Amino acid sequence: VPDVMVVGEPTLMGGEFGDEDERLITRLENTQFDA
């Protein structure tokens, strides 16, 4: 019974792809601000 496998979580077809076209999102705060 050593050949038996367990169903896990589904994966994305192109999971490896897309690192080089990834762009950063910078979190900023406004200097001039009042209500």
Place this chain on the structure above:
Amino acid sequence: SLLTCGGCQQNIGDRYFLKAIDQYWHEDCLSCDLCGCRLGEVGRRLYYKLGRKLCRRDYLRLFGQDGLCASCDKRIRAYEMTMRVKDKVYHLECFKCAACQKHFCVGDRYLLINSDIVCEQDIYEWTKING
């Protein structure tokens, strides 16, 4: 001094804003061009290629490599979810017992004969009837 949003063309007067693709954005204006989902939160990555700002899903749709299904012999699109058994890949709907046609869930036990997924329950009669 004042900064312009690259998605609505209006001046940013809010407390918190973003900086992406050499531009400034209102927290809500930085969205995918195809689906419209906001990219700033939910650990959602930003992708840029040929003028389009895209989410991971819509980037793979437009630029990802396609695979072949072991069950239906039909192409699987790069954005589609799959079940991977060794070097074989299946569409989510094609990942079922070749005997009983039962769809599988996390924790279920099975065997792989050729490209035929057979559940634990059905191994005995499959082996007698096929080897």
